[PDB]
Design a binder for these strands. Structure first.
Ligand SMILES: [Zn+2]
Lengths: 226, 573, 506
DNA sequence: TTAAAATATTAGTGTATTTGATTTCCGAAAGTTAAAAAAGAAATAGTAAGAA
DNA sequence: TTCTTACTATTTCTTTTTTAACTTTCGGAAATCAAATACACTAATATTTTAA
């Protein structure tokens, strides 16, 4: 099923000459599976996306698809030097189904139909090791001190853990396990969305200074900032 | 699945197909070969797969064992180390009393006639320093010392420190007397000058002139006198006397040098000749400084400077497609290009290695094109050191040849240049060549050579390599006592390696098929591990924070025995 | 009301406005037959069904009668791009109207019901036609010489008109009647792309004439009120419009086979008897006569004997026979219907408000127009076929009324006193006999000693006069007269390539 | 008599671009399974002698 | 003279076997890679033609 149209082939074989390149962006999900969802496949007779120009780019935009891991793994094995991966209108995403290359900071998205998470809610409960109802009942302060009420986000419950119950170890460790999903990305920016499966878990350092933000929270509430 | 595989596997090399990169694969999900998928990454071993792996172990070994905890590490304790109200000025006033004027002059004219390339790399006109020797004894009577005069004081006493480090025991005995010192020192009068007393008095003269610099308030008033004094003192084993202090003063030197913010040193057409000579002077100061930056490179050296000088290969490959002052930097910068692989397990490929070799013959002929005067020990000093460095780089290069790809007869090359280096030491046992056995370039080069020849002869017992082992075993005792305990620990190391030579042959290499279980290997693991553990400063940080108290089979038992006998941490003080 | 954004954000805007252009054409066209009456533009009113979409596609894309823009299709470089443009815009109009179909659902227009798979069959039909005309593009399309240039129809068909099959089969094909029943089943599967079972189920009573067409051969195959389901509608409508080639014509082949089957040679091939048709009931006799027979008189001949037939013939013309691809079903098939739309859409009075009713033009006698012409191997691009006056020497009926004159008696009999299917079949047979005598002179020209010409009333010089009429320049011409195939004209209208078809006496 | 207008060497630095490996796998050839066709025999529906 | 009585295609159904289409190892051969060059700006200053 690996097949392409001739104009795109002509584009890719001519793609190398830029040396001023940014922001590669694709729309066709079929074509997406062929050209940057690397899928392990380091070889095709034509259709070679030219490691030099793999290296050159800065950011990637993916407009409108159904699932980025229609396969088992939406990889970015190559594309070393990205910074800003942006998702416009794919339907379902697993956050976990992505390989997330070396060092990029922004990952924004919008208009999606389904969001999994990196299922960090489970991974928290290995460490403090309590019940989910205790975690939702004993372990929620729902802080709105003064800076939380800068924005509204009034569709959403803006939660925070308790500073009393946790002895500041299994808190920093808890927070680092939150970080270990992220591989030091910072900007997240949730626009118009639909159907988060899990809760919303955000590290404190990244929600303070508002590097993550939410614009159109509609199908979604219950954000905890830890 | 999740957290998948990385690259084509043993089943993929079995079948030479596409690698769907799953667990076990999509390759291995087809035909049920998970045992073939996982038995790629217990009994006795029966192969020679230990040797390439152990040569790659030798790299990370040599980045630590030959390098850091043996040499570039001083263990200290804030409680154990005293303060300095006493011997603050006092030992310095002793050694400023004990030195005399003719006692200065004979040392000066020793170093003038015998050590020309040093102050060529430092000052040039050593008779302008004779003027400062003259102004010193006037200024010895003075009180209200200016900052400039104290800088000259620091400079001359650093040179006086340098003079002790290369004078033979006989002339120094003709100038001085063991007994007024060893009455003040209270130590044994029975020992010579050579047996550490040259060394101890040298370290004293170092400490005094640094205390002269502490009287200078050089951290309030930086000037290039500091860098010149440091480049003088770096010719000794002062980096092995106080490595942490040497890194501190190196940091101050790079701070002082870059405080003037000068990139190129060859001037325009229209400068002051004083300015032009000044910039060219900073030229040679710069290359001697970056040489020390390379030689003091370690994890207790967090600030680098020879990264800023570009590689010699990226310039020389174009045109191939004084002179010895820059040539010293050519050889050392070529070593800089060589040995980023010390901690990098990636292989140097077989072109830039060959580029270094095929330039290195031209560097060899440049050493050949140099002269040595049998009258001028400045000139034999000038030629012999370059003649040492060229074969030093040549040995390290061919060692890379045999390790990374098994280049044919690179072992024979190692043996050949080892013969050359041994005969270079042999030539040093003559008149006007004795102090050539004192400069620490041999103390590193010979250590690496004897360690690798030990490493080869523990496992591949070649009788030529074993003969070279015997020659270096003799050459161990053929060394001056100016090196001190770093000598002796090498004696320990030449012990302990050879003692490892006991344990490897007597016990069969066990494995699980590829995980080659041998207690020798685990000993060599923990060698690196304990050294790197004491190289961490985090424990000292937790100590510095105060109330945060610092907290804490046969394959097992033979390790337990040999390490409880042979502590790897026997190499500190 | 949840369907807002995912409808909107489904597409590129460029996509949306191309689709807007296409359904704007659709709306204007439905006002052109005042379906939506006359900006008067609601949403819960606009009907969407596959035949409505289809007839819009007819009226816009294919209907190249259009004398201002008549002959772009003649030029090879113009048409080679123009048909690709046709099929690309075809697919886009399909997607547009599918989008509009989903749009009418969110306004809740229940009048919109798609059945894409019908329109997918339309797509597949036009796709296969363009690919047929695309693979035929050059003598040297690739380094082939004559097998791209070998139609599996005609190489078989013409070589079946030979009165001898000497190397082929004295075992099977002594009689020319058996050759003609083979050619009948072969032109079945050729024109009417079917299965062996579907070829089996043809009585004479399901063989009718063009109502608005006069030329349609309607095989009105209906599920007979019980498959699991009453209200009988599963309507499969087919046609055997004749061919300008007198040797792949279904009507000529049919009239020839029924002449040999009914009358034959007066000495040798004593026919099966021209049927009763007197006290026939509608459903009695014509609904018993098989279209072809072997030894039995009512059922259909033996299956693997036909396998032997096709094996022997495709090894005679040296062609790759594959049994699934003639006996089993293909999907390159005819339209299929319900009872519901079939009664509903073809009723004019339910749509009698309209300026036109689609039964007239683009549905020739309930046939989708391209499913007529593509299956009959024609460029579907007029909607206004007026080729009927192309007739040098229309044959005289005095020669016609010689054979099968009982038909002429039956309409001079009590025409009322016969069953309704009977006289309709009789007029069918008269049309067959007309086409038969029409195509007869080339049959005499190329095989003058067929079993048809084992009858010296045709040997009389009235027929030979008409033979010299139709074959008038044939001896002097370098090339043939009649049409060949839409991409085989400039090869086999040459007489020599036409004689390379023959193996026995070119 | 020359300042003005305007290249060449070396050097310092930097950046595309091969490179020989080296890696990862594709085009083609052997299995695998399902259809097609003759083969073979088991009815079989006609099918010409032999009396009453 | 048309009921027996086994011929006689026939034909029907089963076999087999033969056909052919679909899936799978194997030599070669393209797709990256950290150097490793060859290129390549670019500057400073020596370098190539003329009246008062
Ligand atoms: Zn694999």
């Amino acid at each position: 099923n690996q097949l392409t149209s001739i104009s795109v082939i002509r584009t890719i074989r001519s793609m190398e000459s830029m040396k001023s390149l940014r922001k590669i962006t694709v729309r066709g999900e079929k074509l997406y599976e062929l050209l940057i969802n690397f899928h392990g496949f380091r070889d095709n007779p034509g259709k070679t996306i030219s490691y030099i120009v793999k290296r050159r780019i800065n950011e990637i935009r993916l407009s409108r698809m159904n699932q980025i891991s229609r396969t088992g793994l939406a990889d970015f094995t190559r594309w070393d030097n990205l910074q800003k991966l942006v998702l416009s209108r794919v339907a379902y995403i697993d956050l976990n189904s992505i390989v997330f290359p070396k060092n990029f900071k922004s990952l924004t998205m919008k208009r999606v139909s389904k969001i999994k998470w990196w299922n960090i809610e489970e991974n928290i409960l290995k460490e403090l090791k309590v019940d989910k109802r205790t975690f939702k009942s004993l372990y929620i302060k729902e802080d709105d001190s003064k800076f939380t009420k800068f924005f509204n986000l009034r569709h959403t419950r803006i939660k925070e853990l308790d500073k009393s119950e946790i002895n500041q170890i299994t808190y920093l460790r808890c927070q680092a396990i939150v970080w270990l999903s992220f591989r030091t990305l910072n900007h997240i920016k949730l626009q118009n969305v639909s159907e988060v499966f899990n809760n919303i878990i955000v590290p404190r350092a990244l929600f303070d200074s508002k590097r993550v933000e939410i614009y159109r929270c509609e199908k979604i509430s219950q954000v905890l900032v830890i | 699945t999740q957290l998948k595989s990385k690259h084509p596997c043993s089943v993929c090399t079995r079948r030479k197909v596409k690698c769907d990169r799953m667990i076990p694969c999509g390759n291995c999900r087809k035909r049920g070969q998970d045992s073939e998928c996982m038995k790629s990454t217990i009994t006795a071993s029966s192969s020679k797969e230990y040797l390439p792996d152990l040569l790659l172990f030798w790299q990370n070994y040599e980045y630590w064992i030959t390098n850091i905890g043996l040499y570039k590490t001083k263990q200290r304790d804030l409680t154990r180390t005293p303060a300095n109200l006493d011997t603050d000025t006092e030992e310095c006033m002793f050694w400023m009393n004990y030195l005399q004027k003719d006692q200065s002059f004979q040392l000066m004219n020793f170093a003038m006639e015998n050590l020309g390339a040093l102050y060529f790399g430092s000052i040039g006109d050593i008779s302008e320093l004779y003027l400062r020797v003259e102004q010193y004894w006037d200024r010895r009577a003075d009180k209200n010392h200016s900052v400039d005069g104290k800088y000259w004081d620091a400079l001359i006493w650093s040179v006086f420190t340098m003079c002790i480090y290369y004078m033979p025991v006989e002339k120094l005995a003709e100038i001085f007397s063991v007994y007024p010192l060893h009455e003040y020192l209270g130590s044994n009068k029975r020992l010579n000058w050579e047996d550490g007393m040259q060394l101890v008095m040298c370290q004293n003269f170092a400490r005094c002139s640094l205390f002269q610099l502490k009287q200078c308030d050089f951290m309030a008033h930086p000037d290039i006198r500091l860098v010149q004094a440091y480049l003088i003192l770096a010719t000794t084993t002062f980096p092995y006397d106080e490595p942490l202090l040497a890194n501190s003063l190196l940091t101050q030197c790079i701070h002082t040098f870059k405080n003037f913010h000068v990139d190129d040193f060859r001037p325009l057409l229209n400068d002051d000749p004083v300015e032009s000579i000044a910039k060219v002077t900073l030229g040679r100061i710069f290359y001697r400084l970056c040489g020390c930056d390379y030689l003091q490179s370690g994890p207790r050296k967090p600030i680098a400077l020879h990264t800023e000088v570009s590689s010699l290969l990226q310039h020389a490959a174009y045109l191939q497609d004084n002179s010895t002052e820059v040539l010293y930097w050519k050889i050392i910068s070529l070593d800089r290009d060589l040995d980023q692989y010390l901690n990098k397990s990636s292989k140097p490929p077989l072109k830039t290695l060959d580029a270094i070799r095929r330039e290195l013959d031209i560097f060899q002929y440049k050493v050949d094109s140099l002269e040595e005067d049998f009258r001028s020990n400045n000139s034999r000093f000038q030629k012999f050191i370059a003649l040492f460095q060229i074969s030093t780089v040549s040995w390290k290069l061919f060692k890379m040849y045999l390790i990374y790809y098994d280049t044919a007869d690179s072992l024979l090359k190692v043996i050949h240049y080892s013969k050359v280096i041994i005969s270079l030491i042999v030539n040093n046992f003559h008149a006007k060549s004795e102090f050539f056995n004192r400069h620490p370039m041999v103390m590193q080069t010979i250590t690496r050579v004897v360690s690798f020849i030990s490493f080869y002869q523990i496992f591949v017992e070649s009788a030529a390599v074993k003969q070279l082992l015997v020659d270096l075993t003799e050459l161990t005792a053929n060394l001056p006592t100016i090196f001190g305990s770093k000598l002796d620990k090498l004696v320990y190391l030449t012990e302990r390696l050879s003692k490892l030579k006991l344990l490897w042959d007597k016990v069969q290499l066990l494995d699980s098929g590829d995980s080659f279980y041998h207690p020798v290997f685990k000993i060599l693991q923990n060698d690196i591990k304990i050294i790197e553990l004491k190289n961490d400063e985090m424990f000292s940080l937790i100590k510095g924070l105060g109330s945060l108290v610092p907290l804490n089979s046969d394959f097992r038992t033979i390790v337990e025995e040999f390490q409880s006998e042979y502590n790897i941490s026997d190499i500190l003080s | 009301e949840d369907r807002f954004q995912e409808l909107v954000d489904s597409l590129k805007p460029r996509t949306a406005h191309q689709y807007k252009t296409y359904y704007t054409k659709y709306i204007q066209w439905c006002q052109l037959n005042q379906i939506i009456p006359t900006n008067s533009v609601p949403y819960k009113d606009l009907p969407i069904s596959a035949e409505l979409i289809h007839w819009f596609l007819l009226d816009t894309l294919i209907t190249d009668d259009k004398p201002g823009e008549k002959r772009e299709e003649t030029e090879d470089l113009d048409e080679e791009e123009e048909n690709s443009f046709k099929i690309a815009t075809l697919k886009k109009i399909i997607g547009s109207l599918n989008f509009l179909s989903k749009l009418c659902k969110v306004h809740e227009n229940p009048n919109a019901n798609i059945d894409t798979k019908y329109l997918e069959s339309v797509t597949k039909l036009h796709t296969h036609w363009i690919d047929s005309q695309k693979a035929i593009t050059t003598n040297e399309t690739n380094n082939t010489n004559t097998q791209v240039l070998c139609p599996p129809l005609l190489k078989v068909s013409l070589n079946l008109w030979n009165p001898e099959t000497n190397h082929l089969s004295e075992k099977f094909f002594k009689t020319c009647s058996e050759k003609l029943r083979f050619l009948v089943d072969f032109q079945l599967r050729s024109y009417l792309n079917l299965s062996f079972e579907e070829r089996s189920k043809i009585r004479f009573g399901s063989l009718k004439l063009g109502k608005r067409d006069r030329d349609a051969i309607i095989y009105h195959k209906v599920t007979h009120s019980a498959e699991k389901k009453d209200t009988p509608g599963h309507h499969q409508l087919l046609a055997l419009l004749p061919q300008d080639c007198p040797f792949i014509c279904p009507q000529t082949t049919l009239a020839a086979y029924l002449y040999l089957r009914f009358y034959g040679i007066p000495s040798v091939s004593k026919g099966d008897g021209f049927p009763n048709l007197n006290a026939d009931e509608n459903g009695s006799l014509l609904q018993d006569i098989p279209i072809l027979r072997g030894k039995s008189l009512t059922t259909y001949p033996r299956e693997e004997t036909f396998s032997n037939y096709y094996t022997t013939v495709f090894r005679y013309c040296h062609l790759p026979y594959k049994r699934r691809e003639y006996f089993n079903k293909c999907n390159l098939v005819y339209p299929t219907w319900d009872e519901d739309t079939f009664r509903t859409f073809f009723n004019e009075e339910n749509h009698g408000n309209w300026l036109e009713q689609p039964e007239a033009f683009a549905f020739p006698d309930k046939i989708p127009f391209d499913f007529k012409k593509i299956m009959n191997f024609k460029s579907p691009y007029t909607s206004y076929s007026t080729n009927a006056k192309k007739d040098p020497f229309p044959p005289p009926k005095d020669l016609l009324v010689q054979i099968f004159p009982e038909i002429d008696e039956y309409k001079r009999h009590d025409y009322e006193g016969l069953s309704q299917n009977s006289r309709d079949f009789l007029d069918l047979m008269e049309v067959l006999r007309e086409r038969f005598l029409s195509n007869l002179p080339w049959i005499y020209k190329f095989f003058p000693n067929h079993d048809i010409f084992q009858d010296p009333i045709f040997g009389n010089s009235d027929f030979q006069s008409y033979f010299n009429d139709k074959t008038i320049h044939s001896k002097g011409s370098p090339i043939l007269s009649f049409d060949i195939l839409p991409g085989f004209n400039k090869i086999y209208k040459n007489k020599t390539n036409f004689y390379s078809l023959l193996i026995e006496r070119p």
